[PDB]
Amino acid sequence: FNGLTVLPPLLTDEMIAQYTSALLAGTITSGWTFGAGAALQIPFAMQMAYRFNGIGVTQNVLYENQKLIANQFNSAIGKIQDSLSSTASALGKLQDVVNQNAQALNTLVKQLSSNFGAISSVLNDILSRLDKCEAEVQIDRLITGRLQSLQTYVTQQLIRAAEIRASANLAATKMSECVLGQSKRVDF
Amino acid sequence: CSNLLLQYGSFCTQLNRALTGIAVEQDKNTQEVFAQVKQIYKTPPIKDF
Amino acid sequence: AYTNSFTRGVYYPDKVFRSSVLHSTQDLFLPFFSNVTWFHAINPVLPFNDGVYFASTEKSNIIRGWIFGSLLIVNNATNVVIKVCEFQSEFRVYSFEYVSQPKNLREFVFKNIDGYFKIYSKHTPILPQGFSALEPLVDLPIITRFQTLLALAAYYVGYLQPRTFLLKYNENGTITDAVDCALDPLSETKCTLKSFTVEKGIYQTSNFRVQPTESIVRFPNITNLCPFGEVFNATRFASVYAWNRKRISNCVADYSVLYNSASFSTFKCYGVSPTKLNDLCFTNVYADSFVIRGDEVRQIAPGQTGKIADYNYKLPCDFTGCVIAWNSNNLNYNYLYRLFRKSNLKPFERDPLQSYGFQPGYQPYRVVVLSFELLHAPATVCGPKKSTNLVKNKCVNFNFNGLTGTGVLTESNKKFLPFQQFGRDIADTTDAVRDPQTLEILDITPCSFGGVSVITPGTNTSNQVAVLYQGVNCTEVNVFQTRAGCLIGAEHVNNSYECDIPIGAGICASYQTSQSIIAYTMSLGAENSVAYSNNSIAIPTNFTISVTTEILPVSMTKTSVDCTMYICGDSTECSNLLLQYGSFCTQLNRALTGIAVEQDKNTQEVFAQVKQIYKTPPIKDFGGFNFSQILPDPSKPSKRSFIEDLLFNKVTFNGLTVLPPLLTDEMIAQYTSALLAGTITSGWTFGAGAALQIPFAMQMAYRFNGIGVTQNVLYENQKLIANQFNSAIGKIQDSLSSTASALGKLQDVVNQNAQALNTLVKQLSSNFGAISSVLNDILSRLDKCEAEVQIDRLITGRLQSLQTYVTQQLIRAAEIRASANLAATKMSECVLGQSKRVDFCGKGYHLMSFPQSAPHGVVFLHVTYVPAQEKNFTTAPAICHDGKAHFPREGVFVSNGTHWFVTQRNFYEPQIITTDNTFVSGNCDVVIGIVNNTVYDP
Amino acid sequence: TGVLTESNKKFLPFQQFGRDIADTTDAVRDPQTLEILDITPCSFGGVSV
Amino acid sequence: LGKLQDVVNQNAQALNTLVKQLSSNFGAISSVLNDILSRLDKCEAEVQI
Ligand SMILES: C=CC1=C(C)/C(=C/c2[nH]c(/C=C3N=C(/C=C4\NC(=O)C(C)=C4C=C)C(C)=C\3CCC(=O)O)c(CCC(=O)O)c2C)NC1=O
Ligand SMILES: *[C@@H]1O[C@H](CO)[C@@H](O[C@@H]2O[C@H](CO)[C@@H](O)[C@H](O)[C@H]2NC(C)=O)[C@H](O)[C@H]1NC(C)=O
Ligand SMILES: *[C@@H]1O[C@H](CO)[C@@H](O[C@@H]2O[C@H](CO)[C@@H](O)[C@H](O)[C@H]2NC(C)=O)[C@H](O)[C@H]1NC(C)=O
Ligand SMILES: *[C@@H]1O[C@H](CO)[C@@H](O)[C@H](O)[C@H]1NC(C)=O
Ligand SMILES: *[C@@H]1O[C@H](CO)[C@@H](O)[C@H](O)[C@H]1NC(C)=O
Ligand SMILES: *[C@@H]1O[C@H](CO)[C@@H](O)[C@H](O)[C@H]1NC(C)=O
Ligand SMILES: *[C@@H]1O[C@H](CO)[C@@H](O)[C@H](O)[C@H]1NC(C)=O
Ligand SMILES: *[C@@H]1O[C@H](CO)[C@@H](O)[C@H](O)[C@H]1NC(C)=O
Ligand SMILES: *[C@@H]1O[C@H](CO)[C@@H](O)[C@H](O)[C@H]1NC(C)=O
Ligand SMILES: *[C@@H]1O[C@H](CO)[C@@H](O)[C@H](O)[C@H]1NC(C)=O
Ligand SMILES: *[C@@H]1O[C@H](CO)[C@@H](O)[C@H](O)[C@H]1NC(C)=O
Ligand SMILES: *[C@@H]1O[C@H](CO)[C@@H](O)[C@H](O)[C@H]1NC(C)=O
Ligand SMILES: *[C@@H]1O[C@H](CO)[C@@H](O)[C@H](O)[C@H]1NC(C)=O
Ligand SMILES: *[C@@H]1O[C@H](CO)[C@@H](O)[C@H](O)[C@H]1NC(C)=O
């Protein structure tokens, strides 16, 4: 409440979740076809055979190890829940993003408590203690430094937003290549 | 203090412009990542995969 | 009577010529569409509020009086007379004398500003709706009233008020249009954008604050007067060796009676002004009294050097207080004072001794100093101000014991321990307070504030607007509350469409049907349910060839800014002063030079991916594919393609220098022509070494084989594919010859660099606290030593503008470099080859791509394969023939109901299931879904 | 400082000087003879080796 | 190897510049803090510092 305003995101969390549900449904029911145009349905065990054929394993392997593969996948999915229901350290990349924006803001607000060489950090105190001509000097001293704090904050935010944009472009590329299709790129 | 701030020109039209650009870019980032699908597909009630 | 002022009463505000510019100025103007009083003469004694507009449509002109106040101006239709004296066919105006020289819509504007009576006028032949600027007239030297005399028709009178206007000057330099800024939200948007046209979108125009209703002065219930008589009228003052410190606390001090008293010679207040002293509350007061010589009265001040300052009484540098000295030559060898000390005294420290005499410069002076403590500890001593009754749940201007502030006071559940007087938060702001009169706790919440945004479609479509008050609850301002704030002027609709203008929190707005602005929740897309079954597949039977354009910035305008010019325009003195700041401006130049070099590197990386300059043959036989729209044509002077020209027409002296790019546009076009020729004539081979020629219809078959479609499809649908591609290429021209919005990614790059530069240049018009923004004016008005200060003030701020600009440019150049690296990767992977990466080289299965130069960018025409006509079939993972399972070698098994076929997966081409399109492994007892069918043996 | 040239700009006969986008004195009116002179800053530019 | 060498050089030039900025007055009487503290009293040295 100091001129700060946090705008809400255009896409609410429910609707991000709806997008992800749509992507999962398309991947499950149609494979990579829904990314190239109309969603063409296909049994899951078949697009899985396609995906094995795409890594150099012929498709009889899947049909002869169907139950084993399904059990392995189910166990892995179960292990993800155990990794995420006990340990909070896996989410750090996001948590830092929340923290960095907080620390940047708090600092900014705390810079309102600094004199910057003036008699006081409170503008109304200066205006109530001093005449116009003498208060002008101190208020200019405060402006020169509150403005500098804003410039510092905005430069930091621009750099951080560039980093976040790089990460978001990577995430979009992964969604396009890892979800909407399968990738031959190694360790991508 | 506003009258005194006017002596510094237009630092704070451009600061607002920068922050507004950042905010718009965030929505663009989310749009680019998640809105990669034309329609909203739904899984069938029966789950035989 | 009454009528409307249809955008009348606009005049040239100054004697400055401006042309082809939208200039914003704020002064006394007639508001647009205001109610202007009609009159019909038969006197009417009008007022002079701040300035009078005056329109008239007569020859008679019996408006023959201009009385003020005594100022009495008369304009008698032949000679102007002005008489300033105490005044009280016929001359019945009343019971310095200036004289000036001896069917129509006559317009006039009168105002009195700074002792200047300004008349502006426009005598135009025949309120008429329209626009007409008012040129000035005689400005007179010299008052709150007006008169028109009727010495024994239609005239309209407005009233100017302070308004901001956006005047539009044409090429001839005359005003053709204007915008009343504070009329409607749309005009505020026009002001913010500095334009007369607004595109569809949401624009942050201004900010909204809840103004305080009343001021609450709340001081404790104490009335005992402070004991100031007993330290001023005391009979004996202690000597300056041991200055007598008397504490004052817990009383009401009246400082005005001391200040207005004439007995005191000097009353010097440091850190406070004596007039404001009654408005303040101090935690503690110290009154230190002593007597000194008259010439040493200046030594009692912060930051002074002398025997008294260092050895007797030391004031701190940050001394908040007052010093009061009066000549007391009535009340002598009894004044001991230290003269020799082994060091300097600490501030407010009391301790070789000398005693100068006094025989009635050398005269005695009795002095006291009132050291105040404006801490945030509990206030004890205060002024005589009354304590108003408090109010709650309302934005007020509160003042608790000198703690001023603005906000709503509410009852608090916070439990204060009974020694705590106020509260704080993480921000170290006053979250709560304790009322001195009644010992209760009040929470302080700053009353509502927030930005206000204007939802508008393009002004081409309509002038309707909605207004979003961001993050407020507009019970505190049809009307519809949202999670992003609240929206007025737009109606809520339960339907859901695609987003047109984003509001936030899932809410979008659009101009739709009478037509109005509607608000709704965005619909994420058409609802579709995939008919998934564990034995059904959907095979395409046809396809489409789709050409989609991807626009990528590559570079931006190379620029270089000489600091010594921008900061110190051909000034030696300012250059010498700039040298004191070191080497800021060798490194700023280095940074900008690095950016400029990086731009050329970006273009080199993107376009110079080809060893040689390939040329297409004169004969164009590419299997029916028509590349005339993208290949260069020699008829044009610049060897550019048709699409390249369409793209090149859709994009639009202060130490600044714009360097030219190393690669001219013609040569970028030559690079792109070479890439197109190589792609057409040789395929992907020219990127891997020597260009190996191949018929186009064949490398196209290769590219189909690379997306999982066998090559007979192409040869059997050659003409259809060629026609589809040609039609798509034709549609690109229609998309680019009418709509300019497709090129936005480049246009912004051009705009951002422009706005950054203009701002920079405009920062040269700012004082930054100095007397003037013009360096030569300061150097011509002031001496060297005094001009040095102001010039340093200007440098500190012009240098800051440069640093801001260069930081912005570095960040933007990083973004542009990222985009250029992406464009180079696309050229390498989409053009020099075909990419298996999904949605990288366009949507669909990538076939190829075409580069086209664009201003500071590149355009990739991605030709992709999109399957078109799906058909349901029943399928099976395998087939049991003779107890052994057969799997498809390449493809999938399908059935039209009766027979079983094997077909490729991206195009329905059924074939008889034989032993060469299938392979056998295992027995038919482990595969789930295997079916029984015969497998033919060749 | 600059070069003074004859101007085709038409000043209305109350306008004493002119400006540009940069809010710099693009033109001027000569007090002695009532004529209009365009102001152009005389040539400057970096030198490279 | 230039792409690496520049990285070594850019970090060096940035640092040297920084250190050299300690030799500038910035309008003060001297660039050496102890000189100001030894030449001036507390209140007057406060301004220059
Ligand atoms: C009273 C003081 C007075 C004022 C302020 C005034 C303003 C004024 N009137 C003008 C035109 C003119 N002004 C008038 C007459 C009048 N216009 C009036 O405001 C009034 C009150 C009359 C008298 C009844 C006429 C007839 C013209 C010429 C219009 C034409 O071409 O027919 C002009 C343009 C002169 C030029 O450059 O050609 C000015 C500046 N004239 C005056 O006499
Ligand atoms: C595949 O689609 C194309 C069009 O996308 C079809 O070609 C059209 O055929 C009709 C007649 O059936 C003509 O009137 C159109 O002019 C054709 N269009 C083009 C662009 O040539 C084609 O017939 C479809 N193939 C199948 C097997 O249905
Ligand atoms: C490739 O397309 C262009 C148009 O995009 C064709 O040029 C047209 O040719 C016809 C004659 O067949 C003329 O009547 C038109 O005026 C031409 N239009 C333009 C814009 O030049 C060109 O003929 C096509 N190429 C082939 C080989 O058919
Ligand atoms: C005169 O102006 C006032 C203020 O806008 C308006 O309320 C009133 O209706 C107007 N009168 C007429 C006759 O239009
Ligand atoms: C005004 O501008 C137009 C532009 O077409 C020009 O022709 C004309 O000479 C100018 N002057 C006048 C008085 O119209
Ligand atoms: C006088 O002071 C007491 C002390 O708390 C307070 O309760 C009372 O309201 C005060 N009187 C007035 C008139 O303010
Ligand atoms: C001191 O006494 C004189 C006369 O007795 C009086 O006029 C003056 O107001 C007194 N000053 C103070 C501070 O009491
Ligand atoms: C807005 O005000 C209403 C009425 O005072 C209240 O019920 C609501 O909780 C407030 N906050 C909102 C709508 O977020
Ligand atoms: C929209 O839905 C809300 C749901 O509560 C309902 O109250 C309202 O009447 C609906 N409006 C229309 C126009 O259907
Ligand atoms: C396939 O069958 C489903 C349900 O039987 C139907 O919804 C879908 O439209 C069919 N596909 C085609 C191409 O007709
Ligand atoms: C399936 O295809 C075969 C061969 O083309 C044909 O003889 C048969 O009639 C078809 N059956 C159906 C139901 O389409
Ligand atoms: C799944 O396939 C098996 C055999 O292929 C079939 O018996 C079963 O009915 C199918 N699932 C459903 C839900 O029909
Ligand atoms: C397939 O053939 C085998 C052996 O001929 C038989 O045991 C089995 O029941 C058959 N299944 C179907 C679905 O016809
Ligand atoms: C005197 O003033 C007039 C007014 O314009 C001007 O024309 C003339 O040149 C001036 N005389 C001299 C000697 O400058």
Numbering used by the authors:
A (entry chain C): 855 to 1042
B (entry chain C): 749 to 797
C (entry chain A): 27 to 68, 81 to 107, 116 to 134, 155 to 161, 168 to 174, 187 to 210, 216 to 231, 235 to 244, ...
D (entry chain B): 549 to 597
E (entry chain B): 945 to 993
The authors write:
The spike (S) protein of coronaviruses is responsible for interaction with cellular receptors and fusion with the target cell membrane. The S protein of SARS-CoV-2 is a large, 1273 residue, type I fusion protein, that can be processed by host proteases into two parts, S1 and S2. The spike (S) protein of SARS-CoV-2 has been observed in three distinct pre-fusion conformations: locked, closed and open. To overcome this challenge, based on the locked SARS-CoV-2 S-R/PP structure, we engineered cysteines residues replacing positions D427 and V987 to generate a new disulfide-stabilized S protein S-R/x3.
We additionally introduced a D614G substitution into the S-R/x3 spike to obtain S-R/x3/D614G. Therefore, we determined the structure of the S-R/x3/D614G spike. The proportion of locked conformations is greatly reduced compared to S-R/x3, constituting only ~19% of total particles. Despite the presence of the x3 disulfide bond, 81% of the particles are in a closed conformation. The closed conformation accommodates the disulfide bond by motion of the RBD towards S2. In contrast, in the closed and open spike structures (independent of whether 614 is D or G) these interactions are lost, and the 617–641 loop density is disordered. Superposition of locked and closed structures indicates that the loss of interactions at the domain C/D junction leaves the junction unrestrained, allowing domain C and the RBD to move relative to domain D and the NTD and allowing the spike to open. We proposed that the capture of this intermediate form reflects rapid transition of the D614G spike away from the locked-2 conformation, consistent with our observations that the majority of S-R/D614G spike is open and that even in the presence of x3, only a minority of S-R/x3/D614G spikes adopt the locked-2 conformation.
